[PDB]
Design brief:
Length: about 260
């Protein structure tokens, strides 16, 4: 009886195994755009993905991850609110059963159809496992998805999902360029938070882009064909794998833009 997204193991239950669920810097949050303060000291975000080396795509039973070789100084996030250099390790999405929900962060209570998380670890801690034990260990770049025109740079991901329908399936997924998932603008909000799935560790500087990307209805429909269950188990579609907004408590959300 491990954690998931259902009535009996979903977000409202996670605090029993992971008491930090009720902590002081949990994610996601609602971004109140009128209360977020423009901070002219914030730097432009530096996203340098020219040398990113995707390796593999994995259905891990809660989402799918596109994994990167993070053994060298490649694919890194700097600037913005960050001190020093953060290296890309994986990306994944959260999405809904319907186009009207799926994002983890919300904007003035608006839910997007999905949310992309590009996960990076602070190179001062040497690798990901040590970084998650630190309050400035990770930087997650969050990007909203709305349904409209297709995102051509997403299609390679969509097309491999049939090969990882079920929990534990992976496929080689080399040469995927995450630059194709980025909107035009790097305007962002930022706040201190947590992992949005167990273990819910309070180690993340969240950077949420204002501009969503558009994906087609057909692209997101293919996300919704994935399964939470393993092969030869009763089918439970992988949908609504999002945690709701958590209390802001004593935090300030800062905007990079006026
Ligand atoms: C904790 C841990 C360790 Cl340590 C390892 N490892 O292999 O070294 N893997 N993981 C798993 C993990 O929880 N990651 C995670 C990343 C991003 C998010 S999100 N939705 O972007 O906030 C939530 C969870
Ligand atoms: Zn996530």
């Amino acid at each position: 009886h491990h954690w998931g997204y259902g009535k009996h193991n979903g977000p409202e239950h996670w605090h029993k195994d992971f008491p930090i669920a009720k902590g002081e810097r949990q994610s996601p949050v609602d971004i109140d755009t009128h209360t977020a303060k423009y901070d002219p000291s914030l730097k432009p975000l530096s996203v340098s993905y020219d040398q990113a080396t995707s390796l593999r795509i994995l259905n891990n039973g809660h989402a799918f991850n596109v994994e990167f070789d993070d053994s060298q100084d490649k694919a890194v996030l700097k600037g913005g609110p960050l001190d020093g250099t953060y290296r890309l390790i994986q990306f994944h999405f959260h999405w809904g059963s319907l186009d009207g929900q799926g994002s983890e962060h919300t904007v003035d209570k608006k839910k997007y159809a999905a949310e992309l998380h590009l996960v990076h670890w602070n190179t001062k801690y040497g690798d990901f496992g040590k970084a998650v034990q630190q309050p400035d260990g990770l930087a997650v770049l969050g990007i909203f998805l709305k349904v409209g025109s297709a995102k051509p740079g997403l299609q390679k991901v969509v097309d491999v999902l049939d090969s990882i329908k079920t929990k534990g399936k992976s496929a080689d997924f080399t040469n995927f360029d995450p630059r194709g998932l980025l909107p035009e603008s790097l305007d962002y909000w930022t706040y201190p938070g947590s992992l949005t799935t167990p273990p819910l560790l309070e180690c993340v500087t969240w950077i949420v882009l204002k501009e969503p990307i558009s994906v087609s209805s057909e692209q997101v429909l293919k996300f919704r064909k994935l399964n939470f269950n393993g092969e030869g188990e009763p089918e439970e579609l992988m949908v609504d794998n999002w945690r709701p907004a958590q209390p802001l408590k004593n935090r300030q959300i800062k905007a990079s833009f006026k």
